[PDB]
Design a protein. Structure first.
Length: 199
């Protein structure tokens, strides 16, 4: 029959599929994730720091492993005939690693959706990054300001930054919130040449 490790892997893969799907505003259960993913995600490739496609299975490759080797996975969804570009995030929180996915519209700038995950952040505090009240704020924000890469800031609740898009962080979760801000900037930096590639 199916091996134990195959079943464990399928569960892990479906969890990853769910995360990627949530970044394009699709919320399905584990048992629905493979079909739903295949209905939407039509290209999946690694890019290097120069925005060039490089060999490797984008879905199978560990994001931290890819980033240390200066490789970055791009998943391209076909939503109503138009591409959404989904990028992988990795970083650090208060008590352990953070990761996530963020998608942009066909302009390679405007955020379409986002999903954030963590290993051991605290319920009600840093763990709140995994909730829609946090991630929904990224929708419509831009990574580039008139051509200049800035990423999206995470500010103390109720505050603002002039000249850069921003969202509120988590009350009582400032180190985790900062970790998300840094994760976005550092992770998206790898994708900049792909995002700015232009005919």
């Amino acid at each position: 029959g199916q091996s134990l490790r195959s079943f464990q892997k399928q569960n892990e893969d479906n969890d990853k599929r769910q995360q990627i799907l949530r970044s394009i505003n699709v919320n399905v259960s584990s048992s629905e994730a493979e079909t739903k993913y295949n209905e939407l995600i039509k290209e999946a490739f690694l890019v290097n720091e120069n925005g060039e496609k490089v060999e490797g299975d984008a879905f199978a490759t560990d994001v931290v492993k890819a980033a240390t080797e200066h490789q970055y996975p791009v998943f391209v969804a076909n939503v109503d005939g138009q591409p959404k570009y989904i990028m992988a995030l990795h970083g650090a929180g208060l008590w352990g690693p953070l990761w996530g996915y963020i998608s942009v519209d066909s302009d390679k700038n405007t955020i379409y959706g986002a999903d954030f995950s963590h290993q051991g952040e605290t319920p009600g505090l840093g763990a709140e990054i995994s909730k829609p009240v946090f991630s929904n704020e990224f929708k419509g924000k831009k990574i580039f300001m008139s051509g200049e890469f800035k990423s999206v800031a995470v500010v103390k609740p109720g505050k603002s930054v002039a000249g850069q898009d921003y969202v509120d962080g988590i009350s009582g979760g400032t180190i985790t919130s900062k970790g998300v801000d840094e994760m976005l900037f550092n992770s998206l930096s790898g994708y900049v040449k792909f995002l700015t590639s232009q005919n």
